[PDB]
């Protein structure tokens, strides 16, 4: 069986993602690698109208106050909903193709983000900026799609400072500096937690420890720095102190997602080259997969330029 | 490994009795059956507050032209999370516990809904009552867990006067009686039980998508017909690729699942008895490790204790 490299390019925006990945894709023939771009068509047009510009609104006023927290929730979760789908249809129609982890790919396959930013790290930070309840962030932790053999994920390292600038300059968005802090942390914590699970960490256990990054690398994170410490919050706690029974099932989905993946951090304090090379030599060492049928490479092939064609700008 | 009988007692609300449901709670006092329950408490407290009431209240302000179609399908849209929650978690804390098909099992769970109930047959009623876009309702089947072995799922049976009457008797904390819902909830599931069959029988959706414009169902009577909607199509007509690999999921999560319809028309005991009927031509699995068995009846019972009425 021929072999396949999927890599999810995921992080805070901002940071020059989609220039690295159009860059990297660039190196390689026409069809050795595709790229599945970011839906701005679905997000802007086709899904719903005009998304960012919606999410970023909504933050601003509940920030000024002209909104109650429950009417800026209730618009953050249905539009992180409509944020995720394209990422999911893709996961679950690719599913079935992917066989067991597994001498140059068939095919690579890149990315712009994985299901977890729509289902887990964006709605963290909403969380976080006070515009999502916790109880709708497990919601969507629980409705994370199984994780795929070989799901090697790309996070992005950029210094604040550099970041701040960065985004100052370069749909709908807002400089929100509160909501880039609050990514940022929560992406962090995203590390922390793949490298805490895989080095044995388990929550439950744990739990306890909890009251007042980098993966691939290092040693155990203290639970309070993985995202694990973001669920300690009232509205999830019984009388008795303890995570309701359901809140607690849904970290363990939590666990059970985040564990089999394989994160890897790119620096992004560079030029668009220097980020492109560096990507290159990170997936060196990334997970390929043997995948189901032997017409499945021209097959995820055709979907991924499907998708660009439709729902890339 | 040991066998398992997993039963989702689905279909529209309002068809059943409290001595339906009490009998089902005493069938699952046996070691050998569980019953999960309507995780109610979830839907009035832990997961929000009162999201039943919520629902309701949008649709009749909807209704009356108090806000706008786009504020009732956002907040329709968060809601539908919160009332799906507990199934999406049940569903992925099950799910490695179940080995492949499979005499009596070991275990019996009956549970009061499929993951499908939320996050396709009611948001897919609300896009009917103008409350939901089809966009996020194809998201929602976008997430539908997949579809495992012995996914049995029972739908019921009742003509719409007696369907009346038995919900106008059982509403639930903050619902209001509406006709259009029951119809078009009714509607949904009649849809859904055609859909299984038209898959099961060899139908494919993108085979016949032309008959919607021009042995088994016609398209036309299962889901794929409610999107047509124009929102999911391209100026030229064409379905967005998007929207039609949604409904490649769908027709792969629908094809296993093994329809049972329990008529509702008779007794509590009836009831029971036509569902202890039904339950010969269920599919039974394997677990996966020797554990699995009493994990399951953990979790069961403390779902049960935790979100049950
Ligand atoms: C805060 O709003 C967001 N919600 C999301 O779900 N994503 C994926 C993103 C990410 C991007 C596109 O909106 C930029 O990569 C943002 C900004
Ligand atoms: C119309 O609102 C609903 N949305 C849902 O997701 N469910 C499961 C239900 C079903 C019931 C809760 O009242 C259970 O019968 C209703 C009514």
Same mark, same amino acid.
């Given at each position: 069986?021929? @072999?396949?490299?999927?890599?999810?390019? #995921?992080?805070?925006?901002?940071?020059?993602?989609?220039?690295?990945? $159009?860059?990297? %894709?660039? =190196?390689?023939?026409?069809?050795?690698?595709?790229?599945?771009?970011?839906?701005?068509?679905?997000?802007?047009?086709?899904?719903?109208?005009?998304?960012?510009?919606?999410?970023?609104?909504? $933050?601003?006023? *509940?920030?000024?106050?002209?909104?109650?927290?429950? #009417?800026?929730?209730?618009?953050?979760?249905?539009?992180?909903?409509?944020?995720?789908?394209?990422?999911? %249809? @893709?996961?679950?129609?690719?599913?079935?193709?992917?066989?067991?982890?597994?001498?140059?790919?068939?095919?690579?396959?890149?990315? #712009?983000?994985?299901?977890?930013?729509?289902?887990?790290?964006?709605?963290?930070?909403?969380?976080?900026?006070?515009?999502?309840?916790? $109880? /709708?962030?497990?919601?969507?932790?629980?409705?994370?799609?199984?994780?795929?053999?070989? @799901?090697?994920?790309?996070?992005?390292?950029?210094?604040?400072?550099?970041?701040? #600038?960065?985004?100052?300059?370069?749909?709908?968005?807002?400089?929100?500096?509160?909501?880039? /802090?609050?990514?940022?942390?929560?992406?962090?914590?995203?590390?922390?937690?793949?490298?805490? =699970?895989?080095?044995?960490?388990?929550?439950?256990?744990?739990?306890?420890?909890?009251?007042?990054?980098?993966?691939?690398?290092?040693?155990?994170?203290?639970?309070?720095?993985?995202?694990?410490? *973001?669920?300690?919050?009232?509205?999830?706690?019984?009388?008795?102190?303890?995570?309701?029974?359901?809140?607690?099932? /849904?970290?363990?989905?939590?666990?059970?997602?985040?564990?089999?993946?394989?994160?890897?951090?790119?620096?992004?304090?560079?030029?668009?080259?220097?980020?492109?090379?560096? =990507?290159?030599?990170?997936?060196?060492?990334?997970?390929?997969?043997?995948? @189901?049928?032997?017409?499945?490479?021209?097959?995820?092939?055709? *979907?991924?330029?499907?998708?660009?064609?439709?729902?890339?700008?």
């Amino acid at each position: 069986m021929p @072999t396949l490299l999927r890599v999810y390019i #995921d992080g805070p925006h901002g940071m020059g993602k989609t220039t690295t990945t $159009q860059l990297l %894709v660039a =190196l390689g023939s026409r069809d050795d690698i595709v790229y599945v771009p970011e839906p701005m068509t679905y997000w802007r047009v086709l899904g719903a109208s005009e998304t960012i510009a919606n999410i970023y609104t909504t $933050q601003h006023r *509940l920030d000024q106050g002209e909104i109650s927290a429950g #009417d800026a929730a209730v618009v953050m979760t249905s539009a992180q909903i409509t944020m995720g789908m394209p990422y999911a %249809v @893709t996961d679950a129609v690719l599913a079935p193709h992917i066989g067991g982890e597994a001498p140059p790919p068939a095919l690579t396959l890149i990315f #712009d983000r994985h299901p977890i930013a729509a289902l887990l790290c964006y709605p963290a930070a909403r969380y976080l900026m006070g515009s999502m309840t916790p $109880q /709708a962030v497990l919601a969507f932790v629980a409705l994370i799609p199984p994780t795929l053999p070989g @799901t090697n994920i790309v996070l992005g390292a950029l210094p604040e400072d550099r970041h701040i #600038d960065r985004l100052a300059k370069r749909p709908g968005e807002r400089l929100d500096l509160a909501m880039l /802090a609050a990514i940022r942390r929560v992406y962090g914590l995203l590390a922390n937690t793949v490298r805490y =699970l895989q080095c044995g960490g388990s929550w439950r256990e744990d739990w306890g420890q909890l009251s007042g990054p980098q993966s691939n690398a290092g040693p155990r994170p203290h639970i309070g720095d993985t995202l694990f410490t *973001l669920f300690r919050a009232p509205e999830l706690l019984a009388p008795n102190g303890d995570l309701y029974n359901v809140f607690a099932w /849904a970290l363990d989905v939590l666990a059970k997602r985040l564990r089999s993946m394989h994160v890897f951090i790119l620096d992004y304090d560079q030029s668009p080259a220097g980020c492109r090379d560096a =990507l290159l030599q990170l997936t060196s060492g990334m997970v390929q997969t043997h995948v @189901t049928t032997p017409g499945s490479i021209p097959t995820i092939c055709d *979907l991924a330029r499907t998708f660009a064609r439709e729902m890339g700008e």
